[PDB]
Amino acid sequence: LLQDQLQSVLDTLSEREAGVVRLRFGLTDGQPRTLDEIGQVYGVTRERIRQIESKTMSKLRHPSRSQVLRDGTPEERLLRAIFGE
C-alpha cells in the first residue's frame, strides 16, 4: 500500500530519470546505489547522474507530481527527500 501510488508518479518520468531515482533510493531491491554505479548502468559519468538526479528531484517536488502524495525504509527516505527535514 502507498508504495504503489508513488510507483505511479515514477512512471510519469522518462526511464532514465525514474531508474536514476530508483537506484539512488534502492526502491526495487532495498540497496541504494552510488552515483558511479548508476553511471555505469546508463553509460554516463557520475556527475551527469548527479545533474539528472537534481533536476528529477526538482520535478518530483513539483505539485503536479507531489501534491497527490502528501499523505528507515527506502520509500520513507524518498518521501523525506521530497519534502523538508
Binding site: 537534481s54 533536476k55 526538482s58 520535478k59 513539483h62 505539485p63 503536479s64
Partner: protein
C-alpha cells in the same frame, strides 16, 4: 484543493521551449495556491521549472527563458 498543474501532463511545467513555459505560467494564474507555491519554491531554490506562475533558473526567477540559437538584436 484542485490545482491547475495537476491536470494535463506535468512536464509542461518543465517544458524545454519558452513557449511551453509561458503556457504553464499562464495556467498557474488560476491556482488557489500560487503565492505559496512561489514562496516555497524560492525557499528551496528550485533549479528549473514553473512554480507559482514563474520560471525558475538555478534558484531565481528568469521571467523569460532564452531561446536556443543566437539572440536577435
Amino acid at each position: 484543493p484542485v490545482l491547475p498543474c495537476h491536470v494535463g501532463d506535468p512536464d509542461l511545467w518543465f517544458a524545454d521551449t519558452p513557449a511551453g513555459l509561458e503556457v504553464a505560467k499562464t495556467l498557474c494564474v488560476s491556482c488557489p495556491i500560487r503565492r505559496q507555491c512561489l514562496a516555497a519554491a524560492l525557499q528551496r531554490a528550485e533549479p528549473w521549472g514553473v512554480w507559482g506562475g514563474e520560471i525558475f533558473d538555478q534558484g531565481s526567477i528568469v521571467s523569460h527563458k532564452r531561446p536556443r540559437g543566437r539572440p536577435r538584436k
